Amino acid sequence: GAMAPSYRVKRMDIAKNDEECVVNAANPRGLPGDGVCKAVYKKWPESFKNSATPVGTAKTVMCGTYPVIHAVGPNFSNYTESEGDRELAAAYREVAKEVTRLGVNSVAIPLLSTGVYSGGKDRLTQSLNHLFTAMDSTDADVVIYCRDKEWEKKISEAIQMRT
C-alpha cells in the first residue's frame, strides 16, 4: 500500500502517467477505440491481447510487467440512466478488485463514461463519485487523469472537499 493513500488529479495524457498501473476506458470488444482508449492502444498495444470483457467489468492484461486494467463503462447512448448508473458503479468496483489483486501502490484512472460514452451529458460528478465509492477502501495512491481545464478544477475541488 501507499504510506498515506491519497487522491490527486492531473490534466494530461494518461499514456504519460507516473503510476504503477493504468486503467483503460475500454470498449467491450478490446478494439483500439478513441480518446483515452486510443492513447492506451498506442502506448501499450500488447495489453489488447484478449482484453475484450463485458460492460461493468474489468480485465487486466500485462504489457511487459506493466498492468493495463481494461475497465468497460456503459455507453449512455444505449443504456437507460438507471441501468447505465448501475454498470458504471460496477465497472469501478471491478477496478478496485484488480488494483487490490495486483498489489500496486499507485494507479492512473480516467473518468469512465465521461467522453464518447456519456450520451452527450456532463457525468463528471456521477463518474467521480462512483470512482470514490470503489477506490476509498483501497490503499493505492489514485491519480485521476483528465484533459479539460474546468474538469481539472472541479475534480481537484471534489478531492479537497473530503480532506
Ligand SMILES: [Cl-]
Ligand atoms: Cl499531455
Ligand SMILES: [Cl-]
Ligand atoms: Cl468514454
Ligand SMILES: [Cl-]
Ligand atoms: Cl476531461
